[PDB]
């Protein structure tokens, strides 16, 4: 299977390249290897964009 990630805090994006999200939102990772911001897909909005890795945690 896979490891999903969960938002720990709300976040308001400043660019459309980034997702805005709310605490408890779940994401699939598209790319987590290029840097501290991860390209992700929100299972709530269906949108794809970057998320800040310090705002999420893996499902555990």
């Amino acid at each position: 299977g896979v490891t999903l990630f969960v938002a720990l805090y709300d976040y308001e994006a400043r660019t459309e390249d980034d997702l805005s999200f709310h605490k408890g939102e779940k994401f699939q990772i598209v790319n987590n290897t290029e840097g501290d911001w991860w390209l992700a897909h929100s299972l709530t909005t269906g949108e794809t964009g970057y998320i800040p890795s310090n705002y999420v945690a893996p499902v555990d």
Binding site: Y9, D10, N31, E34, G35, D36, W37, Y50, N54
Partner: peptide
């Protein structure tokens, strides 16, 4: 710096 490598936001 690419989008992936921007500074992270501070924790709330």
């Amino acid at each position: 710096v690419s989008l992936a490598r921007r500074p992270l936001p501070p924790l709330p």
